[PDB]
Each structure stands twice: as C-alpha cells, then as structure tokens.
C-alpha cells in the first residue's frame, strides 16, 4: 500500500548523487565519517522517482551520457548500524535509448531512506 | 498547570542538521536550547529527532500548531510537547 505523491503539496527530498564513468561504484572508504567523493550532484526529488526519471536528470548534468548505448548502474549507499559502517547495494540499471525492466523502479520500492546516497556507475557505449 | 515550552521533533531525515532545526523553528519563537543527539558509533549522524525549548509557552504552542504534521526535507515530522528535565 503506497500513498500517491502530489509534488505540489509534498516538499521534495534532497538526494545526494555520486557518479563514475568506468562501470565501477565508489569504494565504501570514500564515505567514512561523513566524507563523500568528489563531484557530488544534488537533486531535489520525491519518493516515487523512477530510475528512468533520475537517468534523465543525470543526462541533463552530463550531456555525454546522452549517447545511445550508455549504461547507468544504480546503487544505494546506506549506513547500516548493524555493521559499524556504510554498505552499497546495487538496485537496477537503465540504458540510453533502450526500454528496460528497471526503468520504472522507484526509490521507495527499494526501501530507500531519505539521506541514503545514490551511486551511479556509468559505462559509455 | 503552567504550559510547556519544550517540544520533541520526530522523523527527521538523515540530511537534517542541528542548524536546519535552529533556522526552521526560530520561525516560531526564540529558542533557548536545542538537543539533537548523535549516533554513538557514528557521531556524524543524528538519531532522527531533536528537542527544542522556546522562551515562552505561546511560542511552543505555535510551533506545535504549524509543524506537528509539517514537512522537513521531504518527510512528514511529528511535534509534541514535553515535560521533563534535560536527560541525565
């Protein structure tokens, strides 16, 4: 059971996004103690944002990523109090110019909690 | 019989800082004290709540009026009056 989100009535959440261009996600040691990697991209969005929607915002910031065939691998980076540290969990991928089965995956469907980081490993075609 | 001046703010996202809380709730009155505890084993992170004490009960009432059910960083928050001395 999910609540529909009215984006004029619900204020957006701050999403802190990190990207690579070599197909590999950031190491966990780059996030220790509140440090973060270079090139943070700050997005304001909603819990029903989809991978396809987020991909277009990323393409807005990096036009080279627009090229047909570009692969976006999405991972959530999140503090797990159970282990004393950050963990990364890959959630899905999209590709420029292709319709894939993760296009419509949403943050909340993945149990994303606000404040968790998004890490996007991008592979040129 | 005297009315409370201290409020508990709940459901704060992991993005929300002590300064954000000062800035937002100062909208409703003069803040005399804030307590926003951090994760013991990860001090850079809050526990997701704060106490805010105002100078007078009218201000605390106002804050509760406007923000219990209000939103901070895209998430609905709780605001409730608290009658207790600071923790020991």
């Amino acid at each position: 059971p999910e609540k529909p989100i009215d984006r004029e009535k619900t204020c957006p959440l701050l999403l802190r996004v990190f990207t690579t261009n070599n197909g590999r996600h950031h190491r966990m040691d780059e996030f220790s103690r509140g440090n973060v990697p270079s090139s943070e991209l700050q997005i304001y969005t909603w819990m029903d944002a989809t991978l396809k929607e987020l991909t277009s915002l990323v393409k807005e910031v990096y036009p080279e990523a627009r090229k047909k065939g570009t692969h976006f691998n999405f991972a959530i980076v999140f503090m797990d109090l159970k282990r004393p540290g950050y963990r990364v969990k890959e959630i899905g991928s999209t590709m420029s110019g292709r319709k894939g089965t993760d296009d419509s995956m949403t943050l909340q469907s993945q149990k994303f909690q606000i404040g968790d980081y998004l890490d996007i490993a991008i592979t040129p075609p | 019989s005297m009315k409370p001046t201290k409020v508990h703010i709940g459901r704060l996202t992991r993005n929300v800082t002590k300064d954000h809380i000062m800035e937002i709730f100062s909208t409703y009155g003069k803040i005399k004290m804030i307590d926003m505890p951090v994760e013991r084993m990860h001090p850079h992170l809050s526990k997701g709540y704060a106490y805010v004490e105002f100078e007078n009960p009218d201000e605390a009432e106002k804050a509760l009026k406007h923000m219990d059910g209000g939103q901070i960083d895209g998430q609905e928050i709780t605001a409730t009056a608290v009658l207790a001395p600071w923790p020991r």
Binding site: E8, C11, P12, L14, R16, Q42, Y44 | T13, N15, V16, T17, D19, H20, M22, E23, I24, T27, K65, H66, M67, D68, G69, G70, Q71, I72, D73, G74
Partner: peptide, 27 residues
Amino acid sequence: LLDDLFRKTKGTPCIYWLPLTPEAIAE
C-alpha cells in the same frame, strides 16, 4: 516553481520544508 511552493533553508546542504497550511491548522 519549487521556491514558490516550499520553503528552503539557507543552512547547508539546503533542504526544503513546509508547515501546515492555515487551512489545515484550523481544520
């Protein structure tokens, strides 16, 4: 448009917030 709809902090990183509508408080 976001800045018309929602309040934004000066403190960083900047976050948006929003109190209950006058409507909602009375109701």
